[PDB]
Structures are given as C-alpha cells and as structure tokens.
Design a binder for this molecule. Structure first.
Ligand SMILES: NS(=O)(=O)c1cccc2c1c([N+](=O)[O-])cc1[nH]c(=O)c(=O)[nH]c12
Ligand SMILES: NS(=O)(=O)c1cccc2c1c([N+](=O)[O-])cc1[nH]c(=O)c(=O)[nH]c12
Ligand SMILES: NS(=O)(=O)c1cccc2c1c([N+](=O)[O-])cc1[nH]c(=O)c(=O)[nH]c12
Ligand SMILES: NS(=O)(=O)c1cccc2c1c([N+](=O)[O-])cc1[nH]c(=O)c(=O)[nH]c12
Lengths: 275, 268, 276, 268
C-alpha cells in the first residue's frame, strides 16, 4: 500500500491549496501548500500510503452535464478512474452521492451573510462601539434599504429557489424582483462589489470563504449572523473502492484528535493578515 | 424488504422523543411525539418500509464497558441485532463507527456556553472562549463525566488547555452531576456560573420557561448526530440518501424549527 | 543504573515539599508533593536511578556548630553518609562548599523587598484607578524612614547587611541596628504576619522565591517590588568525591535548558496559586 | 603551581574587556581594562599565581562546527590546551559544560525586553512577556542566529510559543544581523520596535549615550556567566572558591556597579 502512489485530485483554490513561495525549485507535492495539502499529508500518514497531488485539469469542482451525461471535475476524475482520492473542498451533495461515496464531513459550513466592516460614519467618546446594521437573516430580510445577492449559480441560488421556510422564500422573491441584476459572475467579483458599495451591499456566500476573506487585507469585510443552512466538505472516494473505510476512519480520528481544528486555526487566524 | 416490520430503537430525550400529553389514549407509534418520531416517519415514507417504535430498556447512549467489552443502550441493541434503525440523537464518534454505520449528520452541533440572561459602556458580555479563559470572576463547569470534560481534558489548543487547568485547580468542583441540576444551578447562580453543554440542548433550554438562560459564542468543536444501523445492514444506502434528500429539501430544518421555536414556550 | 535506592534527603518547607492531600493512604514518595518532589522525579528519570524521599529528622538546612565542629541538618546528613542527594532549597554557600560539592543553580534568587499591596487609601480620574506603590527600590527604602524595614534575626539576609560595604546597604544596616524597638523577627511567618498587620508601615527583606510564593496566597495582601539586592542560587548538593556529582549536574543543566524548570516554577507558583 | 605564568583567554566585549584610551603607552595586562580584567586580577590574587592576558584570535564565543566537530574561540582555545583560564562573559550551557568545567556563575542573566523610552490614564506601557504577546502594534525581534531566537523557537511555554509564531509569520523580518544594528534600529524606530537581548547588554546600553532606550520587565529565562577551565585542570577548586568569596563579600557586585553605573555616561 506504500509502494504504490495514488492520484489525489485537488482544486487550486485558496487557502486550501496555494502556490508555495519559490515553487519552481520544489518538485512534486512540495510546490503546493495549504489546508488541503496538510490534510492529505495527515490522511496518507494515517493510511500509511504514498500519494502525489495532481490538480484536476478542468478546474471545476464537479457536476453532471445536461445532454452528454459525462461527469466533470474531481467527480468526473473519480468516476472514470483518473484519480482515487479527492481531498479538497467538495460539498456532500445528493447528486454527487448517487455515483460516488463520500466520507464524514471534515469541516462544517453553511451560507453566511457578508457585510462591510462597520466604520465611523460622518453625522461616550472615551469608548467607541461599532454597531452592525445587520444582526441575522431576519433583520436582513425585514429592512430592504440594503441590497443583497449571491453568485449567479451554485448551491446558494438553488437553495433560495427551493426553500419553503417562508423567510428565505421572501429573500428569494426580493432577489429575483431586484433591479438591477444582483447576481455576480464570480465570488471575487461579489466581494469586490461588497467592498466598493461602502457597506450598502451584502453577499451570501459560504462561511469558510467568508472567514478566509475576512482575515485578508484591507480587512474591510466581516462575518455576521449564523449559518442559514448546514453542509459539509467530504473526502470523496469512488464507489466500491476499498479505500472508503480507512479514509473515513482517518478523518474521524483526525476530527476527534483536534488536528482538524488546529489546521483550520493555523490556516485562518495564525496566517491571517489581520491578526 | 416488504411484509416485514422493523424495530426502531430510540431514547426518550426532548425534543427528540417525548411522551404525548395524551399518551394513555394512544397506542403504537402514536404514543410518542417529537423530532425523531417525525424523522422516522419521513424516512419510512421515503425508503418504503413499515416500522414500530421501541425504546431502549436501560435508556442510555451506547458506551463500551471497560471490563466486559459489551455495548449497552441503543448502540448495544444495534450491535447485537435486537433493533434495525436508531433514529435518535446518537453522536457520530470514532469508537461507535468502528462497530456500527452512521449516516450523514442530519444535525450539526458543538460545545457552547450558557449563561443566565441579565465604566458602564466598557463592560462586555462573554462571547468567545478566549473571553471566558481570560476572565475568572464567573466560574464555568461541565458534566462530571461526559464528552465535554474529556474534550477539555485531551484538547491541545492553548486556550482550551488553560481552561482545563482552571477547571482542575478550582474548588468547590463546579462539575455538576446532571444536566437538569446543572441548569438549575446556573439559574440559581445569578450570573456567577456558565455551563458548557451541547449546542442543541442549550438552544432548547433557551426556548424553555422561565426564559432566564441564553447561548453565546460559536461552537468550540464540531460534532454531528446520526442515524445508525448495524454493520452490513441492507438499509445503509436508502437511509443515507433519504437523510441527504431531507437535508437539501429543507425538511430537517423545518422539523428543527417546528420542535425548537414554533412549539417553544418563549418568544423570539 | 537502578542498582539500589538512594536516600534523597529533603526539607519539609512549602512549596518545595508539602504534605499531599489524604497522604495516609499513599506510601513512600507519594505522600509528599511539590516543586522539589517533581524535580527529584525528573532528576531520577534523567539519571535512571531509583530513589526514596527521606526528610531529615533535624529539620535544619545545615550549618557548622561553634564548638563540637559537627555538621547538622541536610549538609550534616550528606557529610556523614546518611544521604547521597539533597534536592531542596539549599543555598550554594562558601562554607557549605568546603565539605560537599554543589551542582549548578536550578533557580536564581536574591533578597527582595516585601510590602503590603497598595489599597484605596482614606482621603484627607475616577474611571480608572492606578495603585501607586509607595516604595519602588532599596534606594527609596533607605532614603525615606516613615516605613521601618526588617529582616530575620539570624540568617544570610542579616549577615549580608552586616558584611556589605556599599553605601546604601551600609546605611540600611546602620538604621536597622539603631532602630527602636527591635526590628528583627523570629520566624519568616511571623515577619509576614507583622507586615500584614502593620497596615503597610513595615517592610520585610526575605528571599525572592518565598516572596513570590507568599504573594500568590490569600488574601492577596502582599506583593513584590524592586529588584534583587544580591544574587544567590539553589543547588542539588552531593557529598564530596561522590560519583553522582557529574550526572546530577548535567541533569540539572539539561532540565534548565529544556524549560522544564520554568514550567515547574510556573505550575507551583501561579497555576496552583490560590490568589489569582 | 608557582614560577609559571598562565595564558588567560578573553574577548573584547564591552564593558567586560575594553582597550584603554591610553593603550599605546601601556604594555602587558595594563593594555586592557574592564570588569573581567579586574576579576582576573582578583582571582590571581586569591589563588596566588602569575598570569598574562591573551585575547582570542578569532574573537568569538565557542561554538561546535556541525561538520568538523571542532571548537573555536575561547572554548576552542580551552579545549585544545592553548590557554588556562577564561575570565570572560562565557555563558554556562549544556553543550559547553560537557567538554570544559565552569565555575559557579559570577553574574546572573536572562532575556530582557528593550524599548525606546517615551484615555490617557488608561494607557499601559509594556512590562512583561504577556503584554508584548497580547499586543501587536509594536513589532519585536531578536538576533538572526542566536541563543535568544533558538530559545523562543524551542520553548514549550504557551506565551513564548505564541510569540514565536508571531515572529515566524511577520514581514519584513524583524531579525537583525548584529547587536549594534539592532540597537540603531531601536533608536530609529521611535518606539515601534522592541529588541529582545541579554539582560547585561541591555543594562549597559541603557547607561550609554544618548540614553533613549530602557530595560523593562523581568528575565524571561535564567542563565549565568562563568569562568571556564579545561576539564581536569588543577585550578577548578581554587577558582570556584574564589568566585564564591567575591560573590559573598560583594566584590563582584562592586565591580559590576563600578563598570555599569559609576563609569556610565548616563545619570541615574
Ligand atoms: N463561495 S466560494 O468561494 O466561491 C466556494 C468556495 C469553496 C468551495 C465551493 C465554492 C463554491 N461557489 O462558487 O459558490 C461552489 C462550490 N461547489 C461545489 O460543488 C464544491 O464542492 N465546492 C464549492
Ligand atoms: N443534551 S445533553 O443532555 O446535555 C447530552 C449531554 C451529554 C452527552 C450527550 C448528550 C446528548 N443529548 O443531545 O441528549 C446526546 C448524546 N448522544 C451521544 O451519543 C453521546 O455520546 N453523548 C450525548
Ligand atoms: N526566607 S525563608 O522562607 O524562611 C527561607 C526559604 C527557603 C530557604 C531558606 C530560607 C531561609 N531563612 O530562614 O531565611 C534560610 C535558609 N538557609 C539555608 O541555608 C538554605 O539553604 N535555605 C534557606
Ligand atoms: N552580547 S550579546 O549580543 O547579548 C550575545 C549575543 C549572542 C550570544 C552571546 C552573547 C553574549 N554576551 O552577552 O556577551 C555572550 C555569550 N556567551 C556565550 O558563551 C555564548 O555562547 N553566546 C553569547
């Protein structure tokens, strides 16, 4: 199990995997570092196997095409034998589960509200308390002087289109009826819009990226409110593979040992630029 | 898998499984009401089997005996084949997953802080583990023998380590025998005691009368309840897929709202 | 080694070695716990030698007698072969090194000024309150005479002032000798009690380590101020010519570099302190 | 041990050994003045031997070459028998003690914090390691390759570990090539930089012009200088006893005061 080298497909997306400094003089797995790289190292230690990181050429997480019925991304690589392990942020989704087997979630996340950091507004003085105009999703939906949106596809838009709790239904109604267009092509564009709008726009993106962006310069974004829904990231393995059980037990042992929390803290706050 | 009724095993824990106020005029599955009963009904609807609710006799979550190496409670009933499906708040852990198969978590939780609900603008309420660690006027404690105390015992984080050293060098011992006694002591402490317990229980206690406790801060760790089956059971894939469908369609988040806030005795 | 169990003599003095809670049901070395007990544990682990703690019957640290020329206390027990290692607060001193050999100091200390914690004085800005210490160092202690300063009636602390030639520590000795009534105390505990009772009008000159230990005890009414007047060391004494000198010395040096000694000092001073 | 002159090894370090302003009208031991020269004179008086001061050629404290396993500097001179006594600021450590014999420390030491000497009442100057760890406005750094950086690298204390992680994840690198450049940087930083160096050098620099730096806080760790001799040398016991006598009679403290404050160019 150690002589053979497995293909560990992964996606180039910070802070999970980034180009290491002076990566040209490194070779193999040393060129990439991040949360996912170290998680792969720990998992390979637990299973006692040798691995090589192979970034997926397509650059997509994974979805099934409409007419051709061919899977793409890491899910496509796992299905068609390109790789065997997919240590990367891959949301445990029903449609992804029907073809491949997911392990237990190594990090829990959900849709979170992103707002610009509160600042001294131009119109007791010893101490200053910054009051956030939004406290949760209910306050965001009740008052409509602020605009809020999400990326033009993915899990968030479908979740708002599908929710029936009558609050996110109203949120979806406002989002669809809003003029001009509120959806953003990319998450980076949405963050730029939030920063540029001077606190007049909010972004509904997943909590992990929200916390990562909050700890980056110019430190002008913050996380507010609890998670609207619940999801998780899984270490996907192909259906019927013999590596499912060792991977699952390795993730569970790492989660109980506190190594996962150590990694998240180290790559979110310890290496953050607003610390 | 038809013409056969399965024996579901679940514990009496609120809001999960509670005896109805009209218990003595109802029989069968109609005796019990709660989050887990509705979850079992929906899972039986999706998978397509008939089931009968049955309670574990000893009323405990599964633990491994250090002497006889035997499993008790719902996990013990699952391992020895007395029951088929355990739709209950059974936490996913390394030890149990070695013997039984857990579905994907239908409810995420973690360790949280519960405090009594209350130079003047400089005061700040506790909202994180660091604030509780750096402040010593208000004592904090956990269950005398539980996963929370063990978590602070084995934790490698500096903040949690300092917290644990505070617990082990403080008298009288704040560790309370039971959860009910813990919440009673917190209520009678008048803000001088913070109890560290599971997030779901803290949220439900927040919604219980007379509404004098609140939950602050995020979850210190990450856990998740699960629906366990005996290893090699034929219902692993249908149950997992059903749980995923309820997670995406929002049925689990609807039952949570129904049994936590909609039927809560407190406003919000 | 593990050839035989050695007699590790120690002195019953907190926080180095104290009676453990419910010590009757424990046996052997488990009855005693403290900084010195743990230090003995690490030293015996480093040398790989089994040991037994045996408190010296006399209860004295050790000093040559005037007429019989006999050695008492821990130094006497080491000299006459009743023990082999003394893991205790035995100060490295010239007259104690003429008969036995000391290792490197595992803890540095010196004479320190002890004063009562500043309080809300009765009046004769309000948002934050700063407690100003009336005394900051030995120079201010000697310059101002409204507060009397005392030491222990017979020890290294008094002999340091008797033998010192620096102007500050000579004026201090002159005032202390000419002070009326008697300023020297009988015991360290009695001196601390006098400091506490005098409502901050009396300062006591005792060892820095004990000052830090007492400061972290209830009712948080004592504190340390100023730097150490002199420099001394606490050593793990071994008898002269013993083969255990080098392993003990290297073990203490390794423990000091590894940071284990600082960890133990923190644990037994601040972590287990009752004051905060 | 008479009719023989001993070659004494020492290094040019201020104020331990300094060249006199009248150096070129003096010869022999009269060329050098400082704390260590007077210490050597007193030790030679007490033990009763004739000695000649000889400065180490390469001017370094002893370190072990990883690839040749050879000792350089004063320690290297001691091991190979070129010199007899090293009355110099030579720190007692585990590695050096294994090859040479150190006397009892004649001067205690430790890691100190060096800063430029400067809601108003609520401000708090840095006075301990915890204050420097919790506050990040003022960057702090040590020598690029020294015992201080290694100490914070290997330290197991939580505060020191957090400080080390702060240093290793900060740019530009605050670590300074040499002590003089570090002191100049502290002078020119206007209170935005704190230098972590040995306590004796911090105290001596505090008594140097233009007196814009000060030492604050206690010693983070415990170290001590020593007077080393080759292993098995016949002068170990006389040197140890002489050091103890000078320590008890206050001669060591008197020389330290004379060469730190009495001859200092700064008021106190
Ligand atoms: N908020 S984000 O930074 O951009 C983002 C960050 C991290 C993982 C994402 C993700 C987004 N997305 O576009 O919404 C979609 C998506 N879809 C998957 O299937 C999956 O596995 N992971 C993801
Ligand atoms: N909420 S509680 O009373 O304070 C509670 C306290 C302590 C342990 C619990 C627990 C609950 N629970 O949710 O009922 C469920 C549960 N499930 C497991 O599998 C396990 O190991 N430990 C527990
Ligand atoms: N200030 S104290 O708490 O009571 C005290 C504490 C600890 C050690 C002491 C000591 C005193 N003392 O009486 O001054 C004298 C003394 N003499 C020695 O020879 C020795 O080794 N250790 C000591
Ligand atoms: N002057 S310094 O910048 O603070 C200093 C920096 C770095 C290493 C030092 C050192 C000093 N010192 O104090 O003269 C003495 C010394 N002695 C040893 O034996 C050794 O190994 N390393 C050192």
């Amino acid at each position: 199990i150690e002589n053979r080298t497995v293909v560990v497909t992964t996606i180039m997306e910070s802070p999970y995997v980034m180009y290491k400094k002076n990566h040209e003089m490194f070779e193999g797995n040393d060129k990439y570092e991040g949360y996912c790289v170290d998680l792969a190292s720990e998992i390979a230690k637990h299973i006692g196997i040798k691995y090589k990181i192979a970034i997926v050429p397509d650059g997509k997480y994974g979805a099934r095409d409409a007419d051709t019925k061919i899977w793409n991304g890491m899910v496509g690589e796992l299905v068609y034998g390109k790789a065997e392990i997919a240590i990367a942020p891959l949301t445990i989704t029903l449609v992804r589960e029907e073809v491949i087997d997911f392990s237990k979630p190594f990090m829990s996340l959900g849709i979170s509200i992103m707002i610009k950091k509160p600042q001294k507004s131009k119109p007791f003085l010893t101490v200053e308390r910054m009051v956030s105009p939004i406290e949760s999703a209910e306050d965001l939906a009740k008052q409509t002087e602020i605009a809020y949106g999400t990326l033009d596809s993915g899990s968030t838009k479908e979740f708002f289109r599908r929710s029936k709790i009558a609050v996110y239904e109203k949120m979806w109604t406002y989002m669809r009826s809003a003029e001009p267009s509120v959806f953003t092509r990319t998450t980076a564009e949405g963050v730029a819009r939030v920063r540029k709008s001077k606190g007049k726009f909010a972004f509904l993106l997943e909590s992990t990226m929200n916390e990562y962006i909050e700890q980056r310069k110019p430190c002008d974004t913050m996380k507010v409110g609890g998670n609207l829904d619940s999801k998780g990231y899984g270490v996907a393995t192909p259906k019927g593979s013999s590596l499912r059980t060792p991977v699952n037990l390795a993730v569970l042992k790492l989660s109980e040992a506190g190594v996962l929390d150590k990694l998240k803290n180290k790559w979110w706050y310890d290496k953050g630029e607003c610390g | 898998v038809q013409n056969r009724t399965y024996i579901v095993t679940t514990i009496l824990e609120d809001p999960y499984v509670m005896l109805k106020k009209n218990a003595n005029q109802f029989e069968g599955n109609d005796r019990y009401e709660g989050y887990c009963v509705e979850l079992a009904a929906e899972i039986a609807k999706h998978v397509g089997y008939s089931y009968r609710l049955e309670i574990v006799s000893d009323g405990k979550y599964g633990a491994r005996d250090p002497d006889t190496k035997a499993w008790n409670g719902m996990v013990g009933e699952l391992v020895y084949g007395r029951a088929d499906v355990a739709v209950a708040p059974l936490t996913i852990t390394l030890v149990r997953e070695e013997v039984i198969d857990f579905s994907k978590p239908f409810m995420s939780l973690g360790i949280s802080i519960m405090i009594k609900k209350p130079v003047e603008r400089m005061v700040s309420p506790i909202e994180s583990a660091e604030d509780l660690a750096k402040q010593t006027e208000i004592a904090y404690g956990t269950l005398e023998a539980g996963s929370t105390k063990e978590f602070f015992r084995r934790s490698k984080i500096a903040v949690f380590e300092k917290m644990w050293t505070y617990m082990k060098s403080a008298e009288p011992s704040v560790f309370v025998r039971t959860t009910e006694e813990g919440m009673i002591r917190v209520r009678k402490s008048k803000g001088k005691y913070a109890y560290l317990l599971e997030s779901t229980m803290n949220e439900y206690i927040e919604q219980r009368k007379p509404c004098d406790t609140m939950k602050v801060g995020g979850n210190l760790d990450s856990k998740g309840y699960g629906i366990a089956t005996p290893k090699g059971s034929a219902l692993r894939n249908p149950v997992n897929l059903a749980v995923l469908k309820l997670n995406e369609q929002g049925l689990l988040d609807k039952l949570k709202n129904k049994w936590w806030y909609d039927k809560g005795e407190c406003g919000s």
